Structures are given as C-alpha cells and as structure tokens.
Short mmCIF file of C-alpha atoms and ligand atoms in Angstrom, two decimals:
data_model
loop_
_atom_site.label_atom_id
_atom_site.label_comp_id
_atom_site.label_asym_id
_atom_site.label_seq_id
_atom_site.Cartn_x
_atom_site.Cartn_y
_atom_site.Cartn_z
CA UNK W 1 55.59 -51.38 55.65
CA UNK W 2 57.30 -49.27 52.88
CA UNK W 3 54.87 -46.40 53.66
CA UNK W 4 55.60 -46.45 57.46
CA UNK W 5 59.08 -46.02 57.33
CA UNK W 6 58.43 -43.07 54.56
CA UNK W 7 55.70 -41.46 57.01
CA UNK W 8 57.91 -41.19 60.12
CA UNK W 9 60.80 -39.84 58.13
CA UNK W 10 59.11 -37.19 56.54
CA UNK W 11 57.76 -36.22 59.88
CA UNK W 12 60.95 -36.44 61.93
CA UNK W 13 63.48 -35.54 59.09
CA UNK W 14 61.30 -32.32 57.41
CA UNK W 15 57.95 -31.45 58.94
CA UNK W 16 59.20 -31.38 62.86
CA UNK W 17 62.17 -29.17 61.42
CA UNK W 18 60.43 -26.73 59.48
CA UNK W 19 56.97 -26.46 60.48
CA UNK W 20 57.72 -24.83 64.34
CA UNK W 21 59.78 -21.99 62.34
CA UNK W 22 57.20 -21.35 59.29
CA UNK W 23 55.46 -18.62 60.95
CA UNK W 24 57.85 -16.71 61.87
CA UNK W 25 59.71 -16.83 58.30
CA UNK W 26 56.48 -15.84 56.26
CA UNK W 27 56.59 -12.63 58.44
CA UNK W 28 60.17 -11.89 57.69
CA UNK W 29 58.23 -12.54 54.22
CA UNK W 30 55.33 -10.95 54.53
CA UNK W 31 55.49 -7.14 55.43
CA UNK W 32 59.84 -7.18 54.60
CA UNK W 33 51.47 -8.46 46.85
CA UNK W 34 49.31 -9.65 48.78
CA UNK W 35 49.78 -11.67 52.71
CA UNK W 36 50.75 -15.51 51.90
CA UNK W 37 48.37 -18.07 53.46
CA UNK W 38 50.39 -19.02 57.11
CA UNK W 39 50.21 -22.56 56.31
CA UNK W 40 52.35 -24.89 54.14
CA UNK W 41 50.43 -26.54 51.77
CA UNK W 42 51.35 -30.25 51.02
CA UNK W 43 49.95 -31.85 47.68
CA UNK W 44 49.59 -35.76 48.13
CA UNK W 45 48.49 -36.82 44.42
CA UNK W 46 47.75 -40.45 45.51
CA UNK W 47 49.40 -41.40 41.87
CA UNK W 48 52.37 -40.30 43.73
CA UNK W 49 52.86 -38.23 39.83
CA UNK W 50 55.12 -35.56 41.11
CA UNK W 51 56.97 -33.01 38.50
CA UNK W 52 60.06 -30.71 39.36
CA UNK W 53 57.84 -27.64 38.47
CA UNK W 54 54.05 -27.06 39.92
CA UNK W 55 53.58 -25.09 36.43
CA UNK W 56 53.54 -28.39 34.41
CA UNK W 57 51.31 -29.87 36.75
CA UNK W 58 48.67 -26.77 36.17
CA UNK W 59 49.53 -23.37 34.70
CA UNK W 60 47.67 -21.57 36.74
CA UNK W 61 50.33 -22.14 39.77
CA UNK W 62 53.30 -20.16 38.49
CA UNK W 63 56.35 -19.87 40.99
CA UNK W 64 56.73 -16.24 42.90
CA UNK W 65 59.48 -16.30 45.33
CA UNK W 66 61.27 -18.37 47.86
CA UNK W 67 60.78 -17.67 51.81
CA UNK W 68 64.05 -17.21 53.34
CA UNK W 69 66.19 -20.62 53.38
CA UNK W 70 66.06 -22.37 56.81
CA UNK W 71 69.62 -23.53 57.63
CA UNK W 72 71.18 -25.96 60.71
CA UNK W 73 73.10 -28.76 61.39
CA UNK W 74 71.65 -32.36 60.30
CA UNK W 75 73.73 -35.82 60.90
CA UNK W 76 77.17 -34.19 59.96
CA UNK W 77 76.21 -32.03 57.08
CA UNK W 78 76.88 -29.05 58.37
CA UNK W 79 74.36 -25.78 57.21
CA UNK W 80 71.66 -28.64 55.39
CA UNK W 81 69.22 -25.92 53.86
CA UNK W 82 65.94 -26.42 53.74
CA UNK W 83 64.05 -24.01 51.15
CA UNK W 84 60.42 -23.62 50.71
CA UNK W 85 58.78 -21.97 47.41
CA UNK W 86 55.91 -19.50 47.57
CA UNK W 87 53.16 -19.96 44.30
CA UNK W 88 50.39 -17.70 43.13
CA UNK W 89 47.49 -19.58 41.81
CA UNK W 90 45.60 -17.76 39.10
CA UNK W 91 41.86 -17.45 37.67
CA UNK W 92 41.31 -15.89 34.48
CA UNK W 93 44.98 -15.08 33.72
CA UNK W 94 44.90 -12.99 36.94
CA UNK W 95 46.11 -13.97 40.80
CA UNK W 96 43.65 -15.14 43.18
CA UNK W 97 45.61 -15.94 45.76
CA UNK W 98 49.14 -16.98 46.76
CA UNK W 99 51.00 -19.65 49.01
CA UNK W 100 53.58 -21.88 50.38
CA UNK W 101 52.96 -24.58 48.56
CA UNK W 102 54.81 -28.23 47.86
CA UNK W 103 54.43 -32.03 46.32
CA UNK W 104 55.24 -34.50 49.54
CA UNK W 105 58.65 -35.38 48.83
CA UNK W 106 58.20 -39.56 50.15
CA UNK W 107 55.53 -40.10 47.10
CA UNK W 108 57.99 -39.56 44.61
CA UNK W 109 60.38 -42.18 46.21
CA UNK W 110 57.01 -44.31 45.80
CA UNK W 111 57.24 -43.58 42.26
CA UNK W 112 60.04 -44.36 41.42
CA UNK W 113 60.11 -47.93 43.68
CA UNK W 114 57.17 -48.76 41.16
CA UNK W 115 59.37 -48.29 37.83
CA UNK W 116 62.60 -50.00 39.46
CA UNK W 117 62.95 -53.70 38.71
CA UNK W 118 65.26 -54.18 42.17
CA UNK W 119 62.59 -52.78 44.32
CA UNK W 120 60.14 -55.48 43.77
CA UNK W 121 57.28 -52.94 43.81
CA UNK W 122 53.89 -52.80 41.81
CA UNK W 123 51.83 -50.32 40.52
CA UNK W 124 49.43 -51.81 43.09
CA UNK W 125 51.59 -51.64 46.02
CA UNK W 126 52.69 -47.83 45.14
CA UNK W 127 49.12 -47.21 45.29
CA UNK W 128 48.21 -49.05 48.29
CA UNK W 129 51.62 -47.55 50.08
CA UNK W 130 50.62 -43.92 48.72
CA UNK W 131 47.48 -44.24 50.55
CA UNK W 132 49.31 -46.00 53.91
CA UNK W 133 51.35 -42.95 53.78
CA UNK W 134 49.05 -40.26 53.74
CA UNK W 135 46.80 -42.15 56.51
CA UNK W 136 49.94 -42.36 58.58
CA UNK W 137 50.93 -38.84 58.28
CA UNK W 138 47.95 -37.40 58.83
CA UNK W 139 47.45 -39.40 62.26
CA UNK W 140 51.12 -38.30 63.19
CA UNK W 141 50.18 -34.94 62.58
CA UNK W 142 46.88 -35.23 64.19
CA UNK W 143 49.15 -35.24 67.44
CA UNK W 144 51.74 -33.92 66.52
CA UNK W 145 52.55 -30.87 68.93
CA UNK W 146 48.77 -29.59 62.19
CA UNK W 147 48.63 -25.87 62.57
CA UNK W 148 50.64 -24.93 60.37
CA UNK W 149 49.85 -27.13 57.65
CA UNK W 150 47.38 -28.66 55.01
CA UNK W 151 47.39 -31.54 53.73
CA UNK W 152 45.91 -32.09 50.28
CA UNK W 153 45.24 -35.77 48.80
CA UNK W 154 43.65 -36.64 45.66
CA UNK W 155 43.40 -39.10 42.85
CA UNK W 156 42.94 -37.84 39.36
CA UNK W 157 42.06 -40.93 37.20
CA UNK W 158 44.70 -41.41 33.46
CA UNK W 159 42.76 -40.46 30.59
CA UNK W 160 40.98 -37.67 32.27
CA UNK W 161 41.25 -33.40 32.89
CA UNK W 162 38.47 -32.15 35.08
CA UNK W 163 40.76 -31.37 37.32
CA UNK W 164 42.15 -27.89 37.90
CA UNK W 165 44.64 -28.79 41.09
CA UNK W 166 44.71 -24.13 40.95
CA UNK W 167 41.53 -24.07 41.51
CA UNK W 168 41.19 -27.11 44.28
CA UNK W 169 44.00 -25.70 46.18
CA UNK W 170 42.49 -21.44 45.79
CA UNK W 171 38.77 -23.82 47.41
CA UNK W 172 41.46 -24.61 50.59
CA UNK W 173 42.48 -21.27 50.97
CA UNK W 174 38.68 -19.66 50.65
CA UNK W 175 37.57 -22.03 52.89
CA UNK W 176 40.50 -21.09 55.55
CA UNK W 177 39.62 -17.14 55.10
CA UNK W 178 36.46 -17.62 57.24
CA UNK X 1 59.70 -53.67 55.45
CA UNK X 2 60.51 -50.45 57.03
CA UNK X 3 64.16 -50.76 55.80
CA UNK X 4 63.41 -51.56 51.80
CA UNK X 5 61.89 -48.58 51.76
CA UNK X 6 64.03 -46.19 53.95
CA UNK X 7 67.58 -47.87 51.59
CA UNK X 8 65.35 -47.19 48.33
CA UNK X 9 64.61 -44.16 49.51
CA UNK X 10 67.57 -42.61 50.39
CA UNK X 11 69.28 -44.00 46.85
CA UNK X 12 66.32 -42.27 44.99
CA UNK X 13 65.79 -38.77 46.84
CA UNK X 14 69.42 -38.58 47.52
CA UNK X 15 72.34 -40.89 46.56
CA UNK X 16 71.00 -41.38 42.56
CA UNK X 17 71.22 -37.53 42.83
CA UNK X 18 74.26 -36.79 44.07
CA UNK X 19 77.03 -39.57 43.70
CA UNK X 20 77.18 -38.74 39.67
CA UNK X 21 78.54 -35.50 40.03
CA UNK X 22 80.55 -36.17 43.18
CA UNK X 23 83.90 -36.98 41.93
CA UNK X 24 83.88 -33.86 39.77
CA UNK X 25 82.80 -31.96 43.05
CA UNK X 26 85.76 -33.16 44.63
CA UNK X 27 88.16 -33.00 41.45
CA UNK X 28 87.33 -29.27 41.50
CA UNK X 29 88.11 -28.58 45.06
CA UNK X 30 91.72 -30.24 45.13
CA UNK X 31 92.36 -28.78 42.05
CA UNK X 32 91.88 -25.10 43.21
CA UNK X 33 91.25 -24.93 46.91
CA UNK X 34 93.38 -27.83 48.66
CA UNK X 35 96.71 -28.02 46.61
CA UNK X 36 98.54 -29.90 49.56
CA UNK X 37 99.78 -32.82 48.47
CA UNK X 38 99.04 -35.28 51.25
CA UNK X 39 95.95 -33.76 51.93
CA UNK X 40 93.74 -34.43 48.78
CA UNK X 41 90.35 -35.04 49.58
CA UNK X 42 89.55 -38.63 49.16
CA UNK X 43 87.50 -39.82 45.97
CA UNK X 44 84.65 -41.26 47.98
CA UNK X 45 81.72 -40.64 50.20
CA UNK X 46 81.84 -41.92 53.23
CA UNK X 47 78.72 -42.89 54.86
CA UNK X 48 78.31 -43.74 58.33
CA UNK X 49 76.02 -46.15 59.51
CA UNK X 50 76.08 -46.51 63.95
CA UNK X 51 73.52 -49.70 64.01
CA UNK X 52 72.34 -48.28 67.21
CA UNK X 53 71.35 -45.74 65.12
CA UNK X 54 72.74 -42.73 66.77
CA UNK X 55 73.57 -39.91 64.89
CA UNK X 56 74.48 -36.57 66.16
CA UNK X 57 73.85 -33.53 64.79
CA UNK X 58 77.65 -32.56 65.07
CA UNK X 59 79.55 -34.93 63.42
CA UNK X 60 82.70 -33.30 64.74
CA UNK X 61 81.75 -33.14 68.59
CA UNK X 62 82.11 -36.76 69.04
CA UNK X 63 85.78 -37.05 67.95
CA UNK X 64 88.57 -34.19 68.81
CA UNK X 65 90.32 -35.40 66.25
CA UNK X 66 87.57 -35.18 63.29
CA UNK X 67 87.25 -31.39 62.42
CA UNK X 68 85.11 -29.51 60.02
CA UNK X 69 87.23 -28.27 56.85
CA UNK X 70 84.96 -27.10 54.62
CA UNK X 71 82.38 -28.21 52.04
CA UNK X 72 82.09 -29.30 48.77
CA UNK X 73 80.80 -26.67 46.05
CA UNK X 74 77.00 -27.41 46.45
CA UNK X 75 74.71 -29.12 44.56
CA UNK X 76 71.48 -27.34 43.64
CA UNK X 77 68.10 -28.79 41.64
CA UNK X 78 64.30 -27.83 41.45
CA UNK X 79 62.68 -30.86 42.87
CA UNK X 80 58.97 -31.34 43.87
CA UNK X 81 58.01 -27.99 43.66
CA UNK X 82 60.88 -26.80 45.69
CA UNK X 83 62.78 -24.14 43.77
CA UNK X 84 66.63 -24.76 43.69
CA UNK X 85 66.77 -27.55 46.82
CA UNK X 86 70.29 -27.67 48.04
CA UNK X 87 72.62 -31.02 48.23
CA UNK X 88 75.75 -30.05 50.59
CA UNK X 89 78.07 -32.21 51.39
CA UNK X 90 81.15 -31.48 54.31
CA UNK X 91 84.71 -32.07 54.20
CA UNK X 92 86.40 -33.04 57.21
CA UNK X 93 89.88 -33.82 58.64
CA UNK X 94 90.78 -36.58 60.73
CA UNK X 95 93.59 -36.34 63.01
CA UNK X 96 95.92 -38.81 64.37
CA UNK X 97 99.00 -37.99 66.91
CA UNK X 98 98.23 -34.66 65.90
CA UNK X 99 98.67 -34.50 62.44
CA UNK X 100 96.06 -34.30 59.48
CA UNK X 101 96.35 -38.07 58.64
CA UNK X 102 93.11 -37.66 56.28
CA UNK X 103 91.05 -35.81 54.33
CA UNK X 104 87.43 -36.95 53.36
CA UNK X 105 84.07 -36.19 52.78
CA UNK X 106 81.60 -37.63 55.63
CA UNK X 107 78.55 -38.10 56.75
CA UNK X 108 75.98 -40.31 58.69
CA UNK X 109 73.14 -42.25 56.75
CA UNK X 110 70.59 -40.13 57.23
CA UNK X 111 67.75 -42.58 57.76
CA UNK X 112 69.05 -44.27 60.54
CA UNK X 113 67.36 -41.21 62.31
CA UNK X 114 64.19 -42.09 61.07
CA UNK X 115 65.06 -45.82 62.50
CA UNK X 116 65.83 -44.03 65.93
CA UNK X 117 62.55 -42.04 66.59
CA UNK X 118 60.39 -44.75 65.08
CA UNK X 119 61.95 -46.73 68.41
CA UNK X 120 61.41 -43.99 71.02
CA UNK X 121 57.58 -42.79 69.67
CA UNK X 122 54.72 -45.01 70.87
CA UNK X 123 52.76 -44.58 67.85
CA UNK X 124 55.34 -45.44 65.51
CA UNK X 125 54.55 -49.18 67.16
CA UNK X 126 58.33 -50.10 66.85
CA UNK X 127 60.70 -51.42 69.12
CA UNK X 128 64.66 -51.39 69.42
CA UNK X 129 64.97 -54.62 68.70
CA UNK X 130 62.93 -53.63 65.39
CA UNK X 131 65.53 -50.84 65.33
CA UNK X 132 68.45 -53.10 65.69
CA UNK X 133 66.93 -55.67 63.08
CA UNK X 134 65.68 -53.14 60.38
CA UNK X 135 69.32 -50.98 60.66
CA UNK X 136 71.06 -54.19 59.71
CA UNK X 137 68.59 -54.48 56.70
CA UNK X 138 68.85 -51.02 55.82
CA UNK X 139 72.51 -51.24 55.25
CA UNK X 140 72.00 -54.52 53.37
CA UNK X 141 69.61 -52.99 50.95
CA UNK X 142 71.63 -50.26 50.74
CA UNK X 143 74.50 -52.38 49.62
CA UNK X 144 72.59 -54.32 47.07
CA UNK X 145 71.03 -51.08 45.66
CA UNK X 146 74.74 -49.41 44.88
CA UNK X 147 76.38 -52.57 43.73
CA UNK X 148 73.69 -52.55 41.11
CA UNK X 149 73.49 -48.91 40.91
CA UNK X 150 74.89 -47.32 37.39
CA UNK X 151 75.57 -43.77 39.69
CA UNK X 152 77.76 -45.95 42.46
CA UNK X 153 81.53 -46.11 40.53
CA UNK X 154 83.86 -46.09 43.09
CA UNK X 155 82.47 -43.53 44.74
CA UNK X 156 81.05 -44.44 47.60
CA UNK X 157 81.68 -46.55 51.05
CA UNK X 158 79.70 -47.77 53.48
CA UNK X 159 81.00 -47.69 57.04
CA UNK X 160 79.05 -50.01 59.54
CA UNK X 161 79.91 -50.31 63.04
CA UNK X 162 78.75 -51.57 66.54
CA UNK X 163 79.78 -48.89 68.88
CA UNK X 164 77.50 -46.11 70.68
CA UNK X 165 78.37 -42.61 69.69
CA UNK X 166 79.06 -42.15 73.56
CA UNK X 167 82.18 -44.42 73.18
CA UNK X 168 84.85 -44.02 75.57
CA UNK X 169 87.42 -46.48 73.68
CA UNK X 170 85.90 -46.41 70.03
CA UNK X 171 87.61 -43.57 67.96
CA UNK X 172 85.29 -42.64 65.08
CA UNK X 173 88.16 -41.20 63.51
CA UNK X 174 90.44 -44.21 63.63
CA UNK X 175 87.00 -46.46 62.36
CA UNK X 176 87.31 -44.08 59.34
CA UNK X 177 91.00 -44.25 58.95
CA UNK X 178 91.39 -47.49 58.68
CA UNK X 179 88.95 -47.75 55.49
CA UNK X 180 90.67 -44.59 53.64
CA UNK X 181 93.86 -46.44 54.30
CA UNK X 182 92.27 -49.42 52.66
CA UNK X 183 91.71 -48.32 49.35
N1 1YC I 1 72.48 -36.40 54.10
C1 1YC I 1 71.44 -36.01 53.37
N2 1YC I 1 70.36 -36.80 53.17
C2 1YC I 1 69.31 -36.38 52.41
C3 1YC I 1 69.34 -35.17 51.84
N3 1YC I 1 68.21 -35.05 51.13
C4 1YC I 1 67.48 -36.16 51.29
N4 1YC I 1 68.18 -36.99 52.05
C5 1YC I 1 67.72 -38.33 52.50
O1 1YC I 1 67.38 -39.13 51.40
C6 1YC I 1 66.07 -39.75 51.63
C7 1YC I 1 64.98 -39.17 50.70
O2 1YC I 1 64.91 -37.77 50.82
P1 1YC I 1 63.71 -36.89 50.17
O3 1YC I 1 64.29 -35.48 50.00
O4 1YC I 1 63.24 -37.60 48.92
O5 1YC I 1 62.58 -36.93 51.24
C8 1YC I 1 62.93 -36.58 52.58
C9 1YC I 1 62.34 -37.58 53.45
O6 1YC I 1 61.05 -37.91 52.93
C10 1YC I 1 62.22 -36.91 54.77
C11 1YC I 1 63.50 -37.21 55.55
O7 1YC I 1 64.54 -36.59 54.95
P2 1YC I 1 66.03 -36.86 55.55
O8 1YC I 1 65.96 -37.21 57.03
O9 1YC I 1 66.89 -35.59 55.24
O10 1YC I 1 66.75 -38.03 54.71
C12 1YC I 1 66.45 -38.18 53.30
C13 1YC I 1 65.73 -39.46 53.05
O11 1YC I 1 66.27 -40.50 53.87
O12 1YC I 1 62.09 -35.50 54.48
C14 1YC I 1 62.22 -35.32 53.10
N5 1YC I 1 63.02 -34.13 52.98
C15 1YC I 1 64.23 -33.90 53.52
N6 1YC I 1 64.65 -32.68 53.15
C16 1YC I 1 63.69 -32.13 52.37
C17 1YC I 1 63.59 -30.93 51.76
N7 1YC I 1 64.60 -30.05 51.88
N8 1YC I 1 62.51 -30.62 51.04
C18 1YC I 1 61.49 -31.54 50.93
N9 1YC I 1 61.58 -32.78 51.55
C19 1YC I 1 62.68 -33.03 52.28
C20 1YC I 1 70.40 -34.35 52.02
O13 1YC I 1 70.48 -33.23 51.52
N10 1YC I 1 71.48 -34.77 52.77
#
C-alpha cells in the first residue's frame, strides 16, 4: 500500500536518523526560558491538512528557535541537514510550555496524491492511507530500538473549531511531567 | 503499491520543489564560481537509480574517478512546521584517463533506500523480489510523473542500471558519462 511505503521511509529516512541524537542536541539547547520537553512531538492530523507555519494552524503555537541543525552524508548529497523547530504553546496570551514540535512530513505527500489527477487517489483513500500510516508507524516505533518521541493523531471534522491543537498538545506535555 | 507512492512522493516532497529553480542554481554557479570552459556544470540532475537498490552514503567512494566538487547554492523553505528546511544538492567531477571529462550534479533516488530496508526488516513483510519488482515500478512512475510534470523542462535524467554498487567491472562514472555525452 501507498501508506506502507510512506511509513517505512519516514522511519528509515528521518526518525532512525534523528531521533538517537535528539537528546543530546536539546542539551546543547537547553542550559547553552524554560527546559524544552526531551521528546519530539509529531502532529498526525488524520486530514493529512498540513501548513508551512504551526501559527496558522493555531496561534497559540508561535515559533521560538531552531535546535542546532543535524548534518551527514545521505545517498550522495553530501552535508543533507536535517533541522528541527522548537514552539512555545501559549494560554491566555502567555507561555505555558515549550517544545520540539512538527507536522509528519509523509501526510502531506498524502495530500497532495488526493488533489493530483495522475495519482489516481481519492479523498477516501488519503483518508484510509492517513490512518494505514499512522497504524504502521506507530507499530514500527513500538519496536523500534519510542522514547524520544510522541506521536499525536487526530481528526478535526470541516465546518467545525472546538479544537485548540495548543492546548491538546500543552494536555501531552502535563501529562508527561508526572 | 509501495512504488506509486514512494515516485509520488519523492516528486511532491522533493523534485516539484526543487527542479524549478535548478537551472538558475546552476546558471549562477558557472557564471561566477566555475568559469572553465570545458568544465560547465551540466544543465541537469542526474538521478541514480541501482535497481538492487543500493545506495551508499558516499557517492564518491564507489568510483576513484567521481569526486566531490562542491555544491550548488542551497535551497531553503519553511515546510511542515520545520523552519527554513534545507534542499542541497552536490556537484561532482567525473574523471576519465585522468582528466575532468565531466562536470554534473548527482545523486541517488533517495527512495530506493526505503525499497532496501523494507527487504531486510521482517516487519516490513517484503521480500527482494518485492524489492526488485517495486524498484522497476518506482522508476516507471517516476518517469510518467516528470514527463507530465510542468517543473521537469529539461532538467532532469533518470539513470537506471543493473549493476551492484560492489562492481568490479561496472564504472559508475563511465554509466554517467555516457548519458552527459548524450545530450
Ligand atoms: N535527495 C534528497 N531527497 C529528499 C530530500 N528531501 C526529501 N527527499 C525525498 O523526497 C521524498 C519525500 O520527502 P519528505 O521530506 O516529504 O518526507 C521524507 C520522507 O517522508 C522520509 C524519507 O525521506 P528521504 O529518505 O530523505 O527521501 C525523501 C522522500 O523520498 O523522511 C521525510 N524527511 C526527510 N527529511 C526530512 C526532514 N528534513 N524533515 C522532515 N521530514 C523529512 C532531500 O533533501 N534530498
């Protein structure tokens, strides 16, 4: 399947890259305002709606800093960077609490599938294959030598705000401080 | 299948991205940091595609004569969240009887390392014959995509081949000579 493929790359070709070296660059972050959460957070919006900027997505989540780039060489491109972007969430105008924080990059590729005529790809199947993926990662991951990360699905229905993805995400981190 | 989504993928997170401002990429680095005038670098990106699906790190360790130049001014964009990702892109010479005989920018397909580890981890439930079958899909797709692609003008190549990285008689560097002398 679509989703399978998607799964095992973003495992193989991001998370197994970056993840065994996160801790260690949040403390060249953090003590070189307010410790950052030692986790990445991963946002899996199972309408696979993922904007360039966090802030349009909430305005609560305004951008802080980047951790330090991680750099190496990846299939002939030498020095591939891979950056990662640290967000404070607020409540009542104010910060409640900060972190690494990021949309899954494969559900945008499911996006897009679903508006390109070529890829012979519903709405149905994006949603289906959003699902697949985030099932599939998560049992990767669930052997995968989780730790430092959090995964975060949800489904937030058209015509409707109730949903305050700040506060859902500031929940995570509460619930990890304990 | 595995490989529609892998080729759509890699057009959409990377290729739809990057081949439109390629060319000017390249324009500006003959035009003020490689004035030799048998040593432009080529117009195109060249993208290798082992259907074994084995792709080094190094692209330059398996060939003496393909050596890291330099790279292209890079590419930066917010995407997903992430704050000014970077799109790099390397610039190698190849060598033949010694002599810089070409100049291009180079790289493997990406995903055929996704194809690779699906085939060596149990739980990805695929085999290399799956691997062999889905690479030769991927590059299919792949073609169809950038034939109908409005970002894919002459600016890309695909460059499929049989042979294992670990060669012995198969120069890399002559496979890619032979298409740059092509055009
Ligand atoms: N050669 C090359 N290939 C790239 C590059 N960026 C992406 N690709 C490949 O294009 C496809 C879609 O990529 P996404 O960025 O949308 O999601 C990719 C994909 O879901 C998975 C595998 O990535 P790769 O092995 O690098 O190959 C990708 C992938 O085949 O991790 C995601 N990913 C890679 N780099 C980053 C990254 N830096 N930040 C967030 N996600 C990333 C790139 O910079 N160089």
């Amino acid at each position: 399947s679509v989703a399978h493929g998607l799964a095992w790359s973003y495992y193989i070709g991001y998370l197994r890259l970056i993840l065994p070296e996160l801790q260690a660059r949040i403390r060249t972050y953090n003590q070189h305002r307010g410790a950052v959460s030692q986790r990445l957070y991963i946002l899996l919006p199972l309408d696979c709606g993922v904007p360039d900027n966090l802030s349009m997505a909430d305005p609560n989540i305004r951008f802080l800093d980047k951790l330090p780039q991680q750099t190496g060489d990846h299939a002939g491109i030498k020095d591939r960077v891979y950056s990662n972007s640290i967000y404070e969430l607020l409540e009542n105008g104010q910060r409640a609490g900060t972190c690494v924080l990021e949309y899954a990059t494969p559900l945008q590729t499911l996006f897009a599938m679903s508006q390109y005529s070529q890829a012979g790809f519903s709405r149905e199947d994006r949603l289906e294959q959003a699902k697949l993926f985030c099932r599939t990662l998560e049992d990767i991951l669930a052997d995968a030598p989780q730790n430092n990360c959090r995964l975060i699905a949800y489904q937030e229905p058209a015509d409707d705000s109730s949903f305050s993805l700040s506060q859902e995400v500031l929940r995570h981190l509460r619930q990890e401080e304990k």
